[PDB]
Amino acid sequence: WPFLLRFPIGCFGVCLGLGSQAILWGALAASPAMRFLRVTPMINLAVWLLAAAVLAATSVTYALKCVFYFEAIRREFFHPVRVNFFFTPSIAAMFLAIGLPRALAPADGRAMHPAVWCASVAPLFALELKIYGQWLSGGKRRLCKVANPSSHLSVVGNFVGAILAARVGWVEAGKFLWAIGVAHYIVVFVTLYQRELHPVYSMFIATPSAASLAWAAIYGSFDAVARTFFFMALFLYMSLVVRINFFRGFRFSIAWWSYTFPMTTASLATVKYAEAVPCFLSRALALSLSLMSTTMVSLLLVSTLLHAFVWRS
Amino acid sequence: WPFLLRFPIGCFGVCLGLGSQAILWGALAASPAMRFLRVTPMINLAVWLLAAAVLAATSVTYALKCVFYFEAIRREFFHPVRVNFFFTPSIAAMFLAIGLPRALAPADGRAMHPAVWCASVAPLFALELKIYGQWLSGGKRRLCKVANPSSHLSVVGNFVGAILAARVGWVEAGKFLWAIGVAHYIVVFVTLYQRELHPVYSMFIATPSAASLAWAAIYGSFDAVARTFFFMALFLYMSLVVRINFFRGFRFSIAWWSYTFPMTTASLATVKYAEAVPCFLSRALALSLSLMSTTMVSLLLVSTLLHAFVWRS
Amino acid sequence: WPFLLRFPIGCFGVCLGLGSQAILWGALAASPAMRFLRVTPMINLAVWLLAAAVLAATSVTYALKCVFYFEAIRREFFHPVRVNFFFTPSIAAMFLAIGLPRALAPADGRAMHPAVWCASVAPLFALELKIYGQWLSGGKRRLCKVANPSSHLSVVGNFVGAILAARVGWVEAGKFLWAIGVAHYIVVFVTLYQRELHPVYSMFIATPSAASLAWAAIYGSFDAVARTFFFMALFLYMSLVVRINFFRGFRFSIAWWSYTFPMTTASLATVKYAEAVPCFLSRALALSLSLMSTTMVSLLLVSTLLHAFVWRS
Ligand SMILES: CCCCCCCCCCCC(=O)OC[C@H](COP(=O)(O)OCC[N+](C)(C)C)OC(=O)CCCCCCCCCCC
Ligand SMILES: CCCCCCCCCCCC(=O)OC[C@H](COP(=O)(O)OCC[N+](C)(C)C)OC(=O)CCCCCCCCCCC
Ligand SMILES: CCCCCCCCCCCC(=O)OC[C@H](COP(=O)(O)OCC[N+](C)(C)C)OC(=O)CCCCCCCCCCC
Ligand SMILES: CCCCCCCCCCCCC/C=C/[C@H](O)[C@H](N)CO
Ligand SMILES: CCCCCCCCCCCCC/C=C/[C@H](O)[C@H](N)CO
Ligand SMILES: CCCCCCCCCCCCC/C=C/[C@H](O)[C@H](N)CO
Numbered sequence: 001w002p003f004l005l006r007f008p009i010g011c012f013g014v015c016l017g018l019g020s021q022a023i024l025w026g027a028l029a030a031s032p033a034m035r036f037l038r039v040t041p042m043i044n045l046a047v048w049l050l051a052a053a054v055l056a057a058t059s060v061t062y063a064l065k066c067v068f069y070f071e072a073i074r075r076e077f078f079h080p081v082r083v084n085f086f087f088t089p090s091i092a093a094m095f096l097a098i099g100l101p102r103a104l105a106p107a108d109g110r111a112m113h114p115a116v117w118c119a120s121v122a123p124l125f126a127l128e129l130k131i132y133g134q135w136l137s138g139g140k141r142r143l144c145k146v147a148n149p150s151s152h153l154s155v156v157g158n159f160v161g162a163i164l165a166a167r168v169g170w171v172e173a174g175k176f177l178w179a180i181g182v183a184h185y186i187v188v189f190v191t192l193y194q195r196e197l198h199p200v201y202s203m204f205i206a207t208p209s210a211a212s213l214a215w216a217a218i219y220g221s222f223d224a225v226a227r228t229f230f231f232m233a234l235f236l237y238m239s240l241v242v243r244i245n246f247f248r249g250f251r252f253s254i255a256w257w258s259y260t261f262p263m264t265t266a267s268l269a270t271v272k273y274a275e276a277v278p279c280f281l282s283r284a285l286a287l288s289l290s291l292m293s294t295t296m297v298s299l300l301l302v303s304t305l306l307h308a309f310v311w312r313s
Numbered sequence: 314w315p316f317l318l319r320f321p322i323g324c325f326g327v328c329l330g331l332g333s334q335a336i337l338w339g340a341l342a343a344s345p346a347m348r349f350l351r352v353t354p355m356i357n358l359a360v361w362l363l364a365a366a367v368l369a370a371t372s373v374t375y376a377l378k379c380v381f382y383f384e385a386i387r388r389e390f391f392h393p394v395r396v397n398f399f400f401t402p403s404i405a406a407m408f409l410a411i412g413l414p415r416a417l418a419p420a421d422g423r424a425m426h427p428a429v430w431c432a433s434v435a436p437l438f439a440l441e442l443k444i445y446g447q448w449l450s451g452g453k454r455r456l457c458k459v460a461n462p463s464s465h466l467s468v469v470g471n472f473v474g475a476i477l478a479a480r481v482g483w484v485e486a487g488k489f490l491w492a493i494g495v496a497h498y499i500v501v502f503v504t505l506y507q508r509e510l511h512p513v514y515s516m517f518i519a520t521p522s523a524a525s526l527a528w529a530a531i532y533g534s535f536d537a538v539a540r541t542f543f544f545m546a547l548f549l550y551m552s553l554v555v556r557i558n559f560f561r562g563f564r565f566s567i568a569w570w571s572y573t574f575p576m577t578t579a580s581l582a583t584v585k586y587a588e589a590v591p592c593f594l595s596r597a598l599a600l601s602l603s604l605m606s607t608t609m610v611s612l613l614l615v616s617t618l619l620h621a622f623v624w625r626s
Numbered sequence: 627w628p629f630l631l632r633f634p635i636g637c638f639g640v641c642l643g644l645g646s647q648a649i650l651w652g653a654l655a656a657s658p659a660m661r662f663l664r665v666t667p668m669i670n671l672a673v674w675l676l677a678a679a680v681l682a683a684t685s686v687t688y689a690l691k692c693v694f695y696f697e698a699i700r701r702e703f704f705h706p707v708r709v710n711f712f713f714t715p716s717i718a719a720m721f722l723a724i725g726l727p728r729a730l731a732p733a734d735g736r737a738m739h740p741a742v743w744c745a746s747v748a749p750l751f752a753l754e755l756k757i758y759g760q761w762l763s764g765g766k767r768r769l770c771k772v773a774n775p776s777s778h779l780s781v782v783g784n785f786v787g788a789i790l791a792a793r794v795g796w797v798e799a800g801k802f803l804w805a806i807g808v809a810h811y812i813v814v815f816v817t818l819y820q821r822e823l824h825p826v827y828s829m830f831i832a833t834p835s836a837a838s839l840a841w842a843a844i845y846g847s848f849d850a851v852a853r854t855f856f857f858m859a860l861f862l863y864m865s866l867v868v869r870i871n872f873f874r875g876f877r878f879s880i881a882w883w884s885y886t887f888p889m890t891t892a893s894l895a896t897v898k899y900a901e902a903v904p905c906f907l908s909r910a911l912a913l914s915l916s917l918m919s920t921t922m923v924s925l926l927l928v929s930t931l932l933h934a935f936v937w938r939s
Pocket of ligand 1: 122125170171172173176904906907
């Protein structure tokens with residue numbers, strides 16, 4: 001089949017930015033600050049089922065491509081941009097584990113047995129152990145020659161793994177992942193300021209919002225480090241809507257689907273903050289960012305399921 | 314008038330380093346550690362009135378230059394060194410707001426109504442949103458080609474705004490400004506170590522002392538992060554008196570007036586520290602740095618008001 | 627004597643990595659987590675006496691070389707690699723002060739009179755004030771042209787001095803040294819990621835483990851910053867055994883003696899952690915790293931005292 005050679009690894013962004021929506025809707029349904037919203041816990045279940053189906057689809061499709069044409073993911077893995085998209089097949093699974101619907105989780109049973117944390121973070125941790133080792137000892141694939149805004153996709157995995165580790169109960173593994181995540185977020189942040197794409201340049205917002213969420217999941221509250229990182233993420237989000245006013249052009253692509261993952265985590269951190277600092281301005285900010293990320297995911301969805309059908313119908 | 318084209322933006326340093334003295338004298342008059350000093354609260358009022366008069370003078374003079382010869386501040390704004398001096402016309406106003414004399418503040422009235430924070434930090438926050446956005450997406454004005462010791466003047470604004478926000482009561486805006494200030498202080502600090510002027514090379518001390526003061530104003534006490542930043546500032550101050558022994562030469566200029574702003578904030582942070590850790594060695598250190606910054610401001614003043622009169626008398 | 631001109635400054639690593647073993651054995655004998663180990667406090671005393679004898683030997687030998695052939699340590703000091711080994715003659719003394727045997731310390735007497743902190747950290751602090759000043763104002767010896775993995779030897783001194791300052795009682799000097807240590811560890815860490823030796827490339831582990839130990843000595847417990855730095859050090863240790871599997875080759879040298887100092891501090895931080903978080907996996911990790919660093923020091927020792935005798939016997 002000649003279709004599989006044209007199947008990209010960036011198609012996992014469609015599932016990343018769609019399973020990160022199940023988490024946001026679960027938060028909006030369970031947060032005791034957005035309780036004026038008469039939101040149902042059924043929306044989270046529907047979005048999560050859609051995300052899991054999409055993940056299974058683009059995972060079996062990619063397993064077929066990897067087992068049939070192995071020279072193709074080798075050309076896709078030795079790229080400066082498309083090597084960081086090999087973390088999304090595991091971040092998209094950690095985002096399904098974190099946002100498991102309450103109606104679907106076993107009642108009066110095991111609270112997310114930690115096997116789902118290991119089985120999902122080990123393939124990310126090994127790839128990260130290789131990439132972070134190449135960032136030093138690499139000759140041609142050193143960080144100073146590869147550093148791009150899509151390099152934040154290697155770091156986000158650590159904070160999402162910390163959230164999942166906090167969920168499963170292993171708090172110390174969460175602290176380990178958060179430490180090795182911030183230690184390299186500092187490096188990437190400083191190395192990207194020395195050295196304009198619309199969708200993928202916005203990964204500057206997904207790493208600090210995730211670092212704020214992971215610290216609030218590990219340690220119970222939003223204790224000034226979650227706040228430091230969240231306010232850094234909010235400034236990076238505010239300084240991004242200003243350059244690209246939102247009128248970049250008629251562009252709706254699979255790469256544009258990784259324009260929703262940073263906005264959704266930045267809308268989730270602010271929901272946690274609005275339930276941590278219950279003002280009116282903070283609640284309105286969380287309600288604005290949430291309805292701004294959700295509507296973009298919705299339009300991308302009704303656009304994709306349109307192009308998909310009007311291909312040859 | 315041909316005088317206005319030769320009027321520099323760096324003349325706002327004369328007001329920055331003179332309104333930062335009203336704050337130091339207010340601290341020396343109100344700190345319950347320097348109470349052996351029989352200092353009067355009238356010195357703070359006199360210095361603050363002088364600073365406000367100087368600010369009004371060099372602000373009306375600069376408004377006239379900007380509204381008459383607009384091609385001049387365009388040549389002054391597109392400079393690597395003189396673009397960071399566009400933050401001082403607002404930091405010098407925040408330093409008047411923070412150090413309002415107790416005798417002049419309305420008794421039994423509003424405690425610094427937060428309009429003075431917005432009206433004074435908005436023009437700084439917009440310019441900062443533009444500069445920090447250019448540090449990434451700029452072609453010729455990127456940070457790696459502009460980074461100089463005077464680039465710390467973009468960061469100090471955040472910490473001074475955090476102090477003012479803590480004063481007006483909006484603590485969360487203070488935390489926001491402190492977060493977006495430290496996030497870029499790390500970048501500037503690391504980018505200035507890769508790549509010797511006497512007065513302006515000393516901006517390495519004004520940013521950490523201000524970051525220590527802002528954290529102590531936001532959170533009530535001097536809780537180990539104020540201490541980390543203050544000790545970093547003290548080491549940078551100690552490692553500066555050693556290179557330039559203080560005998561750089563017979564040099565007393567308007568650029569030398571931005572040699573007092575870093576020393577004054579580093580003398581203010583140590584007053585806060587001496588009232589936080591009440592030893593003898595700490596009190597003597599605060600009393601040494603205070604009398605070392607104040608005497609330099611005094612000699613610069615009696616030198617400037619001398620050249621000013623002996624021009625043509 | 628023609629032998630002295632061939633005497634290297636890196637010979638102080640033999641004492642650094644051997645006096646850092648007295649501390650590890652004292653910890654293993656005094657930690658209330660490794661109490662299943664029937665370890666004796668006599669092993670710490672024996673190792674400390676050996677370390678002090680070696681230090682006196684290679685210090686008198688080097689004083690003779692410095693006072694006889696002064697043109698040689700000038701050629702050794704103006705090197706990019708061998709200028710950072712001028713901190714080890716003081717870190718090796720701070721490691722004797724920190725790990726003084728309990729049987730040898732005066733009972734019911736002064737608790738490490740702080741003169742041993744000043745007399746041992748002043749020669750390090752002056753050299754550090756010079757090197758850190760050159761990292762900015764240097765023309766040919768700037769950091770961007772000198773930064774190598776052995777540059778972490780300038781930073782470790784700060785954290786070891788913080789531990790010693792906490793021991794002697796001067797906690798605020800410890801906080802000062804920790805602040806000026808982390809401020810430059812961030813710089814070195816970020817500047818080494820832009821720009822493979824076996825023994826000296828492993829200094830990436832000695833600085834964060836020491837920064838974790840210093841924060842736990844200053845502030846009583848292992849409070850999440852010690853944990854952040856220790857987990858960063860543990861990841862850097864885990865990502866180092868993987869590249870060099872431990873089979874680099876038949877190499878046992880004086881430079882290989884500075885392959886034990888990072889592993890020993892990383893085995894000491896994990897002993898502190900295992901006494902802070904008393905699980906089984908953490909205790910086994912501390913017992914693994916300890917018996918992995920100690921056996922390497924032991925084999926290096928029985929190898930050195932073999933080559934030394936079989937030279938000409
Ligand atoms: C083993 C080689 C790797 C070394 C790094 C280990 C991480 C820190 C060790 C501390 C041990 C400890 O004591 O804590 C770790 C915890 C047990 O503690 P807890 O139940 O969470 O504490 C109590 C908190 N309650 C009360 C809330 C429950 O179990 C673990 O998560 C095991 C970690 C598995 C490996 C994690 C490494 C990360 C890479 C993932 C590879 C699959
Ligand atoms: C709005 C778009 C900008 C997004 C960034 C907002 C900052 C954080 C929001 C948290 C809201 C909150 O809940 O706190 C913010 C506080 C209200 O809380 P508080 O009274 O201080 O808490 C109680 C503490 N007491 C008990 C001590 C009093 O009000 C504000 O300062 C409004 C902030 C105005 C905008 C600040 C943005 C900075 C740029 C300046 C532009 C003029
Ligand atoms: C002097 C020019 C250098 C400026 C930097 C000074 C460091 C911070 C000053 C705070 C003073 C203070 O108040 O604390 C410092 C302490 C006294 O406090 P403490 O007993 O530990 O607190 C009580 C804690 N207990 C209750 C547990 C005991 O004494 C000192 O360690 C003096 C420091 C000597 C110089 C340190 C500079 C580092 C370079 C080393 C050069 C030899
Ligand atoms: C780039 C190398 C250094 C990387 C690390 C930089 C920052 C490390 C510490 C940041 C996170 C620690 C925040 C402190 C939290 C408090 O101590 C409380 N214990 C929170 O529980
Ligand atoms: C350059 C990218 C990362 C920038 C951020 C680096 C450091 C971020 C945290 C430093 C400040 C947090 C200090 C922690 C304070 C404690 O948690 C207490 N809650 C203080 O109230
Ligand atoms: C490179 C320039 C910036 C360097 C500093 C970066 C991090 C500075 C703060 C890290 C250490 C502070 C951790 C905070 C501890 C808590 O506030 C508690 N008070 C601990 O006692």
